[PDB]
Design a protein around this ligand. Structure first.
Ligand code: NI
Lengths: 1045, 250, 100, 50
């Protein structure tokens, strides 16, 4: 379609300007995120028996909820924890692509099957079924500056004013409040209850009767007696609103006359619902909002939806309430993609320079300049119309593409700049004869190259989604580079190019430019003679080429492997895990020592440390802690030393001091729960009915035997927690019956006093909140305190607890686990220094075989899937290698000449590898996509030399040895031009400092190092490749001069 | 009709045509919602709203017939059960309530079958004895000893105001406010003023735009970018057809 | 037989609070009547799958269902997905005068 | 003149059609028994019929 658009400048122009307008809209309306949602969907079911043991929550909630789960689709595996915190959490994980929303329902269909089988006390609390990624999105702090309000206030303020709104905004898959909304809190004094001869059961009943809201009808309600006039609602009791109101509840009238009100036997206080989570922002008291992301958001959009929901709340706050921002995986995602665009522009201005150096014409140089954005713009469109987000990966794809785009433009212009310099034909005429001479080459080029890019869109699992983002972002660029190549660039070629008199090579004019063209035209002549001479000598190089291959392969297997490189994300976290029981306090001591370091030893880099006692990645408990640490701005942290890789390092080495405490500082996985990096996840299973202790032992014995292989397995450990002393209390029933006490009265006063009991709601300032009765903490801190509580037999005599109870210590677990319905214990660990994941497993699959009868195993999470280079990918290239070979055979009409091109592939790959090995860099996703592009570009470079070579045989009658070099000298400039353009073009990426560099450097160095070797070796080896493939294959031929049809 | 029905004493009555479709009658004014953003309770929102309504009427030139869509507080019969005296007399607070709410409000007891179909059973007071304030005293309930005790013994009634249509918008208490955009002035402006008037309100009380006001419409907002590009788009294909940057203008 | 406060403070509130992490929700808009009625009206974006939108609403309703009063759970809470204006109204009268 | 006519012309969305069927609202004070409303509903029902 060129010489129609060559005759219609404007009708071309229109096409471009429509793709510009198209993509321009598509840029605006398209989602902006870091990566595509590559997480399996992670539906989750969260229960909580208040005051329960880990067995009493597993055996009464978790089990009856896993059993009623079935006939639920695509379910890959179910994975429940159960805590002596009184928590369950069952985590059904569905295939990729699974409709998250259907997956969410089916889960609950089968939950209600089970709901009237859970205890009354658990159904009250409210089971919850979400569908959400594990890692947080942002954490929003809330502190008080004006000093007026404690942490229990701040929590509550937000709890009852800020979270309810936030939780309802779309995208938010789960909000964890750091702290708790308030709760009328009746703290029971047991000594006083006994004096007045009353039990928590009386107190619980009293609340229920007096803090109730009753329904009681209407005056003149339907149906009325005929001729009724008035119709009014009747009101009876209405919920209590205040400490004072609860305070004066009546428990009993003495037959004295005396009155005994609730305040007489309990401190009444607005207090926490629960009291385990306590937060601190730079050590100042704080609460906040720990927010997740519903399977398959939706860009920054969800965090964007917030300050909307938040900034509507900033005017109605009380005195000194100040929101703060301690953790934000958003400013990174914004300052990541934005610093890519920057390099796109740079890559544009450079190319223009490199265009201008060679072709010295301020207009000519504007052609390929104009050509790029048009195509780029156009791509975001095709992307939009397919369903791909403007993401980190895609944006690189775009910068890479410049090469496989910019190239196309040059050739079109250059070859005309050539043709005009060689025949004398005016711009309009010259480009006709030019474009009908390279036409079918450029189309074929888009096919043999998409035969390397496309198969990458297929496919394997979590890693596969990432490649796709590239395949379709690159090929899009390509075909549009080709459409543009046949409509805009030629159109522009005929109209825009200034005429070049027959045989004017710019050798004799001006200062610098005149010099350049003098040294270049010389150089290409030294270049031709150099090739002409080595054609003489049947590849001594041929040997040297196989040497290059041999060495390529060594470098390849010598290079270590990776997936995606950890980036500094301006924000990381520190783990804190104590022994047991290990009170809240002991952990706080620890959290301080950590908070101290970041603030004393590490001021320079740390901005803020939102730290939180009683919450753990893993879960809930006095024994756990976690600190979200926010650094200062990238630019104010120059140097390795001041990046996170160093900071976490330097910290974790320091925290090793701490006595009796696991503490680790660690960078963020690089995204989502997309950290399938870092080892494995071996799960053990009680496949018979073996019970708890035996799995402990089995696991002890596996752990113990895994340590005895330091050479292919290391730091093999359980992810859980170990059995800690529990206080078993045996109620001697007989003696209780004998004494005349209800076993219902007993239990309720035990569990009430010690565990606490949600009695019934009340209203606190226009909001419904809970009422929890519990023992004042003085009388529930110690073993001998059991005896202090009394309860009331039928006769009326209060009886001590020691009468009918006998206590005793006993071991047991605070994190009973279950995998796929069966009891299990989870086992993490790494793959020894030089050995892979695959092998480290093989051994673990054997070691677990020498275990006792009953105990078996399975691979969950990161171990279920596996990854990339080692497994499958090689069938992708392998067919891609065949696929390319077909379209080459196509273009050339040869079963031999295609080889001439393919054999360039290993000439960039040698460089790609060198630059990679010589920079500590790894074989990672980015490298590969770079590698491809590199094999792409090199293919093109060869393809055209060969192509041209052929035409001078199939149109003239010039022996290969004659036509090949006559070709090579014809092609060399454009090869250098596209190459020097792109080598410089990417230079920005292989320099980048701070924020996203991890990627940009990967994308960059591999490409540049690859691109340089590639284009200096192909420039000599291709003309060999051709002649050798040309002379080896064929039979009645000339090697000399034929001529003429 | 509506002109005729205006006769009726003590009664809002309106005859109105159907919106022209669905709930696709985003025509006819706005839907301003007010919000108790602090913990201000009911009475104060009433007042805040009274004070907004009162101030909106004082601008007949860019806002008209500004009104609440709800209903106003009507006398309710609050009954206080003196618990002590009830305990003193020996009556269960469960027995009391159940006979109050039963007799006056009615209680779904349990289903029965009526000709092959399950239907409900509701117990309630015959209407003669639940029509009037002094009727409260007629109901008796049974203490532990066995003596039936009157209601006046342990209950003290009294009148009190309160709402028959407590509202809430987005989880928070609210009161809804309808009204039109004055004769010559748009929706957009009539709002702007309402966004200002609501700013001079008391501390705690805020606002938001629901329903028809959330979206906005057409000519005034965006459409002009549609034609504007459409004007450029056409101009391109004309240039295309003619091969001219000028002749397309023709 | 409830008041407007006793339905709002005992049903409406405990049902709006248990609503969250429900997608595309534009705004929630509850009335509560001294008739003994609640009515919470979650309104979703345009194009939203009405059928998914219907479920998510109730996922979070049962979170709340054993927290409403006994007498309300009996009566049966109901969650529909439906336009406001009627489609048709079908009358039924008795001509032969036999039935009230 | 085109432009004057344009800004001079009022705006609408879709025009009310006669749909062979419309409705009439009825809202009383309070409490305002069922009866009082029926009286009202009659007066309305009367007009359409008389
Ligand atoms: Ni020479």
């Amino acid at each position: 379609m060129p010489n129609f658009f060559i005759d219609r400048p404007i009708f071309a122009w229109v096409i471009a300007i429509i793709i510009m307008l198209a993509g321009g809209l598509a840029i605006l309306k398209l989602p902006v995120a870091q990566y595509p949602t590559i997480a399996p969907p992670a539906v989750t079911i969260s229960a909580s028996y208040p005051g329960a043991d880990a067995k009493t929550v597993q055996d009464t909630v978790t089990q009856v909820i896993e059993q009623n789960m079935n006939g639920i689709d695509n379910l890959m595996y179910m994975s429940s924890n159960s805590d002596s915190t009184g928590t369950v959490q069952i985590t059904l994980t569905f295939e990729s692509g699974t409709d998250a929303d259907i997956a969410q329902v089916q889960v609950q269909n089968k939950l209600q099957l089970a709901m009237p089988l859970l205890p009354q006390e658990v159904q009250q609390q409210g089971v919850s079924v979400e569908k959400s990624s594990s890692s947080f999105l942002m954490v929003v702090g809330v502190i008080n500056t004006d000093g007026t309000m404690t942490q229990e206030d701040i929590s509550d303020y937000v709890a009852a004013n800020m979270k309810d709104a936030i939780s309802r905004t779309s995208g938010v898959g789960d909000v964890q409040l750091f702290g708790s909304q308030y709760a009328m809190r009746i703290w029971m004094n047991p000594n006083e209850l006994n004096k007045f001869q009353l039990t928590p059961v009386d107190v619980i009943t009293a609340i229920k009767a007096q803090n109730a809201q009753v329904a009681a009808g209407q005056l003149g309600g339907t149906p009325p007696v005929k001729g009724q006039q008035l119709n009014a609602s009747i009101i009876a009791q209405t919920r209590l609103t205040s400490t004072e109101e609860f305070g004066k509840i009546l428990l009993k009238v003495n037959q004295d006359g005396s009155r005994v009100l609730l305040r007489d036997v309990a401190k009444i206080e607005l207090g926490g619902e629960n009291y385990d989570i306590i937060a601190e922002f730079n050590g100042q008291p704080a609460s906040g909002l720990g927010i997740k992301l519903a399977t398959g958001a939706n860009a920054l959009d969800t965090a964007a939806a917030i300050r909307a929901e938040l900034a509507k709340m900033e005017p109605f706050f009380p005195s000194g309430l100040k929101i703060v921002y301690p953790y934000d995986t958003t400013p990174f995602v914004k300052i990541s993609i934005h610093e890519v665009v920057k390099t796109l522009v740079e890559a544009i201005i450079l190319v223009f320079l490199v265009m201008y150096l060679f072709l010295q014409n301020f207009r000519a140089t504007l052609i390929p300049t104009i050509a790029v954005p048009v195509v780029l713009l156009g791509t975001f469109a095709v992307l939009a119309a397919f369903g791909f987000s403007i993401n980190t990966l895609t944006m690189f794809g775009m910068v890479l593409a410049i090469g496989l785009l910019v190239d196309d433009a040059i050739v079109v212009v250059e070859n005309v700049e050539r043709v005009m310099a060689e025949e004398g034909l005016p711009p309009k005429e010259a480009t006709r004869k030019s474009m009908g001479q390279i036409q079918g080459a450029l189309v074929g080029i888009a096919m043999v190259l998409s035969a390397v890019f496309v198969p990458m869109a297929f496919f394997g699992g979590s890693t596969g989604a990432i490649y796709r983002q590239f395949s379709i972002t690159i090929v899009s660029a390509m075909a549009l580079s080709v459409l543009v190549a046949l409509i805009l660039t030629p159109a522009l070629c005929a109209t825009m190019l200034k005429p070049i008199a027959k045989g004017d090579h710019g050798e004799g004019k001006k200062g610098f430019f005149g010099w350049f063209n003098r040294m270049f035209e010389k150089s290409t002549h030294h270049y031709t003679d150099s090739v002409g001479g080595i054609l003489r000598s049947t590849g001594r190089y041929l040997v040297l080429y196989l040497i290059i291959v041999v060495g390529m392969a060594y470098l390849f297997v010598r290079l270590p492997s990776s997936f995606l490189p950890d980036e500094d994300q301006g924000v990381f976290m520190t783990m804190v895990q104590l022994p047991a029981g290990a009170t809240q306090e002991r952990t706080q001591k620890v959290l301080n020592e950590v908070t101290h370091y970041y603030l004393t030893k590490e001021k320079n880099n740390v901005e803020s440390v939102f730290a939180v006692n009683g919450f753990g990645f893993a879960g809930r408990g006095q024994n756990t802690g976690i600190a979200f640490v926010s650094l200062k701005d990238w630019a104010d942290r120059p140097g390795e030393e001041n990046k996170v890789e160093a900071i976490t390092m330097r910290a974790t080495r320091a925290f090793s001091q701490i006595k009796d405490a696991m503490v680790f500082a660690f960078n963020l996985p690089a995204i989502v729960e997309l950290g399938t990096a870092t080892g494995f996840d071996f799960e053990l299973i009680d496949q018979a009915g073996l019970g708890h202790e035996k799995l402990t032992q089995a696991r002890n014995q596996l752990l113990a035997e895994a340590a005895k292989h330091p050479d292919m397995l290391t730091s093999v450990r359980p992810n859980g927690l170990e059995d800690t002393p529990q206080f078993k209390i045996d109620i001697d029933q007989e003696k209780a019956q004998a004494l005349g006490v209800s076993i219902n009265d007993i239990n309720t006063t035990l569990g009430a006093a010690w565990g606490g009991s949600y009695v019934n709601d009340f209203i606190d300032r226009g909001r419904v909140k809970k009422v929890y009765v519990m023992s004042e903490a003085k009388y529930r801190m110690l073993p001998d305190d059991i005896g202090d509580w009394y309860v009331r037999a039928a006769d009326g005599q209060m009886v001590p607890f020691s009468a009918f109870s006998s206590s005793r210590w006993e071991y047991g677990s605070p994190r009973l686990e279950r995998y796929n319905g069966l009891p299990s214990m989870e086992i993490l660990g790494q793959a020894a220094p030089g050995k892979s994941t695959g092998e480290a497993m093989e051994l673990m699959e054997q070691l677990a075989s020498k275990l006792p009868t009953g105990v078996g195993y399975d691979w969950t999470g990161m171990s279920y899937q596996e990854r990339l280079s080692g497994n499958q990918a090689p069938s992708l290239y392998a067919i891609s290698l065949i696929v390319v070979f077909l379209c080459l055979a196509a273009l050339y009409e040869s079963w031999s000449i295609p080889f001439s091109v393919m054999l360039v592939v290993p000439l960039g790959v040698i460089g790609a590898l060198l630059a990679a090995t010589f920079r500590g860099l790894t074989n990672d996703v980015y490298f590969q996509v770079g590698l491809l592009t590199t094999i792409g570009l090199s293919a093109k470079n060869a393809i055209l030399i060969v192509e041209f070579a052929k035409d001078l045989m199939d149109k003239e009658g010039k022996g290969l040895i004659e036509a090949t070099l006559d070709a090579v000298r014809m092609r060399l400039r454009p090869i250098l031009m596209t190459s020097l353009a792109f080598i410089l073009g990417v230079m920005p990426l292989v320099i980048s400092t701070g924020a996203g560099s991890g990627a940009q450097n990967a994308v960059g160095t591999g490409v540049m190092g690859g691109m340089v070797t590639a284009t200096v070796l192909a420039i000599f080896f291709v003309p060999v490749f051709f002649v050798v493939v040309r002379r080896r294959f064929s039979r009645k031929n000339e090697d000399i001069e034929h001529s003429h049809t």
